[PDB]
């Protein structure tokens, strides 16, 4: 009647009941405590505790990342609250590209780039990269680059790839003022004479921010160059047609 | 209409990377061989280079030379013949000692000794194998992750042809060595034991198979979907949180009302598909040992 | 509530339909239209579902159970009892199901993102439609689709291979199976190597993607790296049910037999099909 196989399957529960809490309290490092839509802790926080801290040693002397710690956005949020009582959209105060909110939102990262396996820049363009080159499908550098709206922007000068996985992760765009912007391999839809980007509209390429170096992107540059783009695909939807 | 990042646009060269500082031992190590452009359109175009230490030749001999077994034995029953080889080559099959021989190994080899003799090669290449898989993460001071997780596999296999034949009695409780054979072991099994449908050993186990499709499914869609905020630098992502991180988070929280980590989606991940073999394995192995009908047993035990 | 980083990604817009009228969040979960459309449809079809329950005469959740009209009955509708339980939550299911996707296509919009997951999620909606509404369809009754019962479908599955001898030998079965054991085994292999790098050996720092294509290199002389794992899992889960709906829609409207008999094709083929031994000799 309570058998060895009737004494393993209710073994078996428990522990998948164990192992599920356990499963769920690993991803509750980034994000908690849940808050309130005005910053403070939420009361009903799940039936879930928060997990006891643990680190990771960055490599090349990169420092210590423990978490759960405390968050902090780190940046300020230019939205505001429209509502009385929560579970309301928030309002963009500015100008919501620029800003860096909604779809075009970035993220407070370190100010560095990131460092492959030896220690050097994970990110370097071609020009720098001592034996890179291009070895199969249409060759975009020279290709004239194209927006939403159908007009042209500036011309890719060079190709900014990724040393140890040998991948190409953003074409650089010359303007027509000759300064350069890096646009994100994703975005883009290489063709045999041009280079198309749904994203933005050929006058919001000057908007893409900017480099502090020619031959390094870091972190907080990768994540204000991209979510900037992305965000086109909303706010620079009035130029759109078709 | 917008790129979709399924297949790779312009593909990049640079001096292939040999993998110097860290422990691996380069005594061992070939050289790099071509590149695929094949496979570059999809993935790494870099073949090569192999590790091979001695735990990987004892493998790789012992993995031929249960191959070869079950080759030769397969020409023998094609009466030597190309063309029958051919013809059958999904039909011959290498079979266990009949049941009135035990758990002997004086079984003739003609009637199940070179099933026993393949079976020990085979033994052999899964086991230095999973040593391989321990050795080349130490090498690299990576975690054993791999190791455990192949654990699981070995486990089910182990079942399959050495536990519960032990536990049996005979060899003949074993699987066959041809590719419709084995098959026909499969629905065999349950018909013996009353409907593996009842085994809820095996509806866990199918539950987690799903699952798996489900979750991977899941995770590669997400991944592509924010890799335009290089989504798949995951580990980075995991030492400094993007955006990448975020905006996957929150369609999952938007949608069914919780979410993962950068990490955390990688533990989910390892556990849904380990518990597929953990669970078979269990269930097989009280099969006819301790339970051997499950749909009666199913009765008087709940359901 | 929020994630703490969540508050500035919750603005206006991305709707397909309604505009503003529905875009706003209860909890963790955002609305929009087809929020309201998904809440209707899944909850009418519970509430058939323990209407069918008062019927059948028990509340107990492992036993309660809903099939299809019967074969006689065709494709047209039946009466509640009789089967229009099941075609109406059957309706209502695959309203839900919809729904559902057509949401993830509005988040996916106004976080930004590609649209990939809903496109994934098409595949899971076109393989239970394969089984109660293409399939049926082309065989003539909604009684060739599943019921609706923890342990009753699984008999149906049984019955349904049955019919064909060994369903193993079901060719798509075959690629199926091929793909759904390749899926798990590429899921545990890229949980593992992440987790190694993320998680190395005491006393050492963070691995790097690096470690990650060395690894598997030295394993397997290989790596199809950190873009080429994430395009391969999906297609391997994709490509699994793809071949399934492929399995289940030609047996029984283009194919009859017990599924070995296709096997034959090579077997029997006449220039070594009169040879002396082997197997088939
Ligand atoms: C795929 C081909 C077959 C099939 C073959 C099998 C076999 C064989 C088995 C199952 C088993 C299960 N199947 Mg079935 N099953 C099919 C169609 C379905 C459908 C559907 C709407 O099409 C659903 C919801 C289910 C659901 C389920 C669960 C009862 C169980 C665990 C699956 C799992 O973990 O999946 C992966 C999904 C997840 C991990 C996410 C969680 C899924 C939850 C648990 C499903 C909830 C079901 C709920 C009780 C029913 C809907 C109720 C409404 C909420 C009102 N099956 C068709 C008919 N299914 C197993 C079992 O133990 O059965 C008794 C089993 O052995
Ligand atoms: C008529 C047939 C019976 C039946 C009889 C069985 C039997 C018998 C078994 C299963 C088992 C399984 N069944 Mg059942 N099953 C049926 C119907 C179903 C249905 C369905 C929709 O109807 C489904 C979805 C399933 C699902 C499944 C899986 C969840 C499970 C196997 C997991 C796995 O990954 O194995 C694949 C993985 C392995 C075997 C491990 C391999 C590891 C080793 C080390 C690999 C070595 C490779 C070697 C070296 C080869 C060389 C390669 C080269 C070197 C490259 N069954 C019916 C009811 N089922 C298993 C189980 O555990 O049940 C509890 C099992 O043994
Ligand atoms: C004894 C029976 C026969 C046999 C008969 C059959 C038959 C008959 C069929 C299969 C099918 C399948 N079999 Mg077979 N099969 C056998 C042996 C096996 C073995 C084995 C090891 O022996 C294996 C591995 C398999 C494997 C498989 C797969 C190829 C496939 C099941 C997955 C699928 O289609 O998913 C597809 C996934 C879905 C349908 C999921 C849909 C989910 C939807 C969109 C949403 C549900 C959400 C839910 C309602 C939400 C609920 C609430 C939430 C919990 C919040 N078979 C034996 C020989 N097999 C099936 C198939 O190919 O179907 C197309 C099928 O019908
Ligand atoms: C957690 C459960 C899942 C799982 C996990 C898993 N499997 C694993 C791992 C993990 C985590 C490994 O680390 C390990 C590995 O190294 O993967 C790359 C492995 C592995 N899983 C394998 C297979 C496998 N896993 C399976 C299943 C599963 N594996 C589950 C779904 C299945 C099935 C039936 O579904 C199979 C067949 C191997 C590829 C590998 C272990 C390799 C091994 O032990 O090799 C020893 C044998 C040899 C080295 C050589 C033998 C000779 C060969 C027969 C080839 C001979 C060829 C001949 C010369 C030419 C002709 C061939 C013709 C086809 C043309
Ligand atoms: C195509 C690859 C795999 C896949 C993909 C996939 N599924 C997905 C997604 C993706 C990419 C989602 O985005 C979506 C999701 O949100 O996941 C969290 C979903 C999802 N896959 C789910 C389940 C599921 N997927 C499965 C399969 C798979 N889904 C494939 C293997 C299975 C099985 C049997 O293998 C199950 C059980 C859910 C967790 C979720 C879909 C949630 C959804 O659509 O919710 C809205 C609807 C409801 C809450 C209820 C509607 C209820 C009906 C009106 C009444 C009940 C009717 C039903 C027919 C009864 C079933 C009886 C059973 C006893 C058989
Ligand atoms: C890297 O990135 C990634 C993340 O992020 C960092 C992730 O999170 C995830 C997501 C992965 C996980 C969270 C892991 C766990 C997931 C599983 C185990 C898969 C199984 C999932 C479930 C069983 C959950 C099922 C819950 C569902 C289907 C929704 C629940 C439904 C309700 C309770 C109500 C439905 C809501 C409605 C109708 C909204 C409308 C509201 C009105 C009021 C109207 C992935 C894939 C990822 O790759
Ligand atoms: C050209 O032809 C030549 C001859 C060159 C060839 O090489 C042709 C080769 C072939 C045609 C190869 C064909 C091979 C196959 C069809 C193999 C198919 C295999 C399977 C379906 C495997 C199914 C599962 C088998 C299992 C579960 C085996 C279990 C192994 C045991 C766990 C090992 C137990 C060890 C024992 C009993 C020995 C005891 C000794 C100890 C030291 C423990
Ligand atoms: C409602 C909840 C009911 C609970 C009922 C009792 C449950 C009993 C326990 C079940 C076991 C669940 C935990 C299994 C996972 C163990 C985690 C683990 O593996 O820890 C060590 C880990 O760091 C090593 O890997 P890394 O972190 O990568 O080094
Ligand atoms: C009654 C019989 C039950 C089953 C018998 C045993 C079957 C084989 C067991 C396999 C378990 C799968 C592997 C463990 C889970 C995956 C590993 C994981 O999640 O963390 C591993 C962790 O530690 C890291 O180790 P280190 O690198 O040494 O720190
Ligand atoms: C000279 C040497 C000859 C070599 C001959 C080629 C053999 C191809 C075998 C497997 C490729 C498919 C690998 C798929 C499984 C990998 C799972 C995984 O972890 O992928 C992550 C990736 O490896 C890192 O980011
Ligand atoms: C069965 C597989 C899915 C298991 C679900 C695990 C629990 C999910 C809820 C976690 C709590 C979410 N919350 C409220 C903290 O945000
Ligand atoms: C699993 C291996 C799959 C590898 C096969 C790759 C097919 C080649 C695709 C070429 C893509 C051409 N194009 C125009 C998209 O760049
Ligand atoms: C030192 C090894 C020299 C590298 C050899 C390069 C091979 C040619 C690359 C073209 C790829 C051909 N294909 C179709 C397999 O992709
Ligand atoms: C080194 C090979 C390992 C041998 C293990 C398998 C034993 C085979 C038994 C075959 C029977 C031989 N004999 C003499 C009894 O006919
Ligand atoms: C790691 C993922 C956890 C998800 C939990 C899945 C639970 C599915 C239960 C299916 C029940 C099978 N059976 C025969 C025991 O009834
Ligand atoms: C075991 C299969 C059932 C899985 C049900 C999915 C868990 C429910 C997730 C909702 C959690 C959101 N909530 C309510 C905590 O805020
Ligand atoms: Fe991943």
Redesign the interface.
């Known amino acids: 009647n309570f058998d060895l196989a009737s004494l393993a399957i209710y073994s078996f529960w428990i522990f998948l009941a164990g192992l599920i809490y356990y499963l769920q309290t690993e991803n509750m490092r980034?994000?908690?405590?849940?808050?309130?839509?005005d910053?403070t802790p939420?009361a009903?926080?799940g039936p879930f505790p928060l997990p006891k801290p643990k680190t990771?040693?960055?490599?090349?002397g990169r420092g210590t990342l423990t978490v759960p710690g405390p968050?902090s956005?780190d940046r300020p949020?230019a939205?505001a609250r429209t509502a009385v009582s929560?579970?309301?959209?928030?309002?963009?105060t500015g100008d919501?590209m620029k800003d860096?909110?909604?779809?075009?939102?970035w993220?407070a990262r370190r100010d560095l780039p990131e460092?492959?396996?030896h220690g050097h820049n994970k990110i370097k363009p071609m020009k720098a990269a001592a034996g890179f080159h291009v070895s199969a499908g249409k060759n975009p550098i020279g290709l004239p680059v194209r927006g939403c709206d159908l007009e042209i922007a500036g011309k890719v000068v060079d190709i900014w790839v990724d040393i140890?996985?040998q991948?190409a992760r953003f074409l650089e765009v010359e303007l027509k003022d000759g300064s350069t912007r890096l646009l994100p391999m994703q975005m883009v839809k290489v063709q045999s004479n041009r280079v198309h980007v749904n994203a933005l509209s050929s006058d919001l390429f000057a908007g893409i921010p900017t480099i502090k170096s020619p031959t390094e992107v870091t972190l907080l540059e990768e994540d204000k160059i991209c979510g900037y783009v992305?965000?086109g695909?909303?706010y620079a939807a009035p130029k759109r047609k078709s | 209409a917008?790129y979709?990042?399924?297949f790779?646009q312009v593909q990049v060269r640079g001096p292939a990377?040999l993998?110097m500082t860290?422990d691996?031992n380069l005594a061992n190590r070939?050289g790099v061989?071509p590149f695929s452009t094949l496979?570059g359109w999809?993935?790494?175009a870099?073949?090569?280079?192999?590790?091979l230490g001695s735990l990987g030749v004892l493998s790789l001999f012992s993995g031929l030379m249960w191959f070869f077994t079950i080759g030769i034995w397969f020409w023998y029953?094609?009466?030597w013949?190309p063309?029958?080889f051919?013809?059958?080559l999904?039909?011959?099959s290498l079979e266990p000692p009949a049941p009135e021989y035990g758990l002997s190994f004086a079984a003739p080899l003609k009637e199940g000794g070179l099933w026993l003799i393949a079976s020990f090669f085979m033994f052999v290449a899964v086991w230095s194998w999973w040593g391989?898989?321990y050795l080349?993460?130490?090498?690299?001071?990576?975690?054993?992750?791999?190791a455990?997780?192949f654990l699981?596999?070995i486990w089910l296999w182990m079942v399959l042809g050495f536990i519960r034949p032990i536990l049996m009695g005979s060899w003949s409780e074993a699987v066959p060595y041809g590719i419709?054979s084995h098959?026909?072991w499969?629905?065999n099994f349950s018909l013996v034991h009353g409907?593996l449908?009842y085994n809820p050993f095996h509806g866990l186990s199918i539950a987690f198979?799903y699952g798996?499709?489900?979750?991977?499914?899941?995770?590669?869609?997400?991944?592509?979907?924010?890799?335009?905020f290089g989504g798949?630098?995951?580990?980075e992502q995991?030492?400094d949180?993007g955006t990448a991180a975020?905006?996957?988070?929150?369609?999952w929280?938007?949608?069914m009302?919780?979410?993962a980590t950068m990490?955390g989606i990688?533990?989910?991940?390892?556990?849904?598909?380990?518990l597929?073999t953990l669970t078979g394995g269990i269930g097989i192995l009280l099969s006819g040992t301790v339970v051997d009908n499950w749909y009666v047993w199913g009765q008087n035990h709940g359901? | 509530?929020?994630?703490?980083?969540?508050?500035?990604?919750?603005?206006?817009?991305?709707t397909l339909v309604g505009g503003?009228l529905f875009?706003?969040?209860?909890?963790?979960?955002?609305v929009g239209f087809f929020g309201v459309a998904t809440f209707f449809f899944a909850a009418l079809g519970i509430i058939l579902i323990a209407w069918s329950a008062v019927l059948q005469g028990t509340w107990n959740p492992?036993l309660i159970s809903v099939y299809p009209p019967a074969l006689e009955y065709g494709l047209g509708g039946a009466p509640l009892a009789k089967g229009g339980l099941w075609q109406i939550i059957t309706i209502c299911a695959t309203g839900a199901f919809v729904s559902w996707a057509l949401?993830?296509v509005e988040?996916?919009?106004?976080?930004?993102?590609?649209?990939?997951?809903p496109?994934?999620?098409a595949?899971?909606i076109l393989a239970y439609l394969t089984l109660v509404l293409f399939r049926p369809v082309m065989m003539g009754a909604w009684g060739y689709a599943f019921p609706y019962g923890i342990?009753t479908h699984?008999?149906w599955?049984?019955n349904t291979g049955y019919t064909y001898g060994?369903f193993?030998?079901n060719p798509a079965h075959m690629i199926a199976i091929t793909f759904?054991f390749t899926?798990?085994?590429?899921?545990?292999?890229?949980?593992?190597?992440?987790?190694?790098?993320?998680?190395?050996?005491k006393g050492?720092?963070?691995?790097?993607?690096?470690?990650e294509?060395?690894?598997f290199?030295?394993?397997?002389?290989?790596?199809?790296?950190?873009?080429?794992?994430?395009?391969?899992?999906?297609?391997?889960?994709?490509s699994?049910?793809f071949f399934s709906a492929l399995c289940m829609i030609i047996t029984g409207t283009i194919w009859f037999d017990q599924w070995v008999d296709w096997?034959q094709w090579?077997?029997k083929?006449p220039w070594?099909?009169n040879?002396?031994?082997?197997?088939?000799?």
């Open positions: 980034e994000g908690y405590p849940l808050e309130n839509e910053g939420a009903n926080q990771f040693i960055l490599p090349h968050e956005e949020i939205l929560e579970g309301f959209p928030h309002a963009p919501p860096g909110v909604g779809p075009a939102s993220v460092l492959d396996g140890p996985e991948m992305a965000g695909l909303m | 917008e979709q990042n399924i790779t990377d993998c860290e691996v070939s061989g496979l999809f993935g790494n870099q073949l090569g280079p192999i590790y029953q094609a009466g013949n063309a029958v051919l013809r059958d999904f039909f011959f391989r898989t080349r993460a130490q090498a690299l001071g990576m975690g054993k992750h791999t455990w997780a699981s596999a419709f098959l026909d499969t629905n409907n449908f198979l798996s499709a489900l979750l991977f499914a899941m995770h590669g869609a997400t991944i592509l979907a924010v890799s335009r798949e630098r995951e580990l995991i030492a949180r975020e905006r996957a988070a929150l369609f929280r938007w949608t009302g919780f979410n990490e990688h533990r989910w991940a390892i556990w849904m598909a380990v597929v359901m | 509530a929020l994630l703490s980083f969540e508050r500035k990604y919750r603005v206006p817009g991305g503003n875009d706003f969040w209860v909890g963790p979960f955002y492992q949401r993830e988040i996916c919009r106004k976080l930004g993102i590609g649209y990939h997951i496109f994934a999620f595949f899971a342990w699984l008999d599955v049984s060994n193993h030998y759904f899926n798990a085994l590429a899921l545990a292999l890229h949980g593992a190597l992440v987790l190694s790098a993320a998680n190395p050996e050492k720092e963070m691995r790097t993607p690096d470690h294509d060395c690894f290199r030295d394993l397997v002389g290989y790596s199809i790296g950190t873009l080429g794992i994430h395009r391969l899992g999906l297609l391997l889960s994709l699994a049910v096997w090579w077997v083929l070594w099909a040879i002396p031994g082997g197997i088939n000799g």
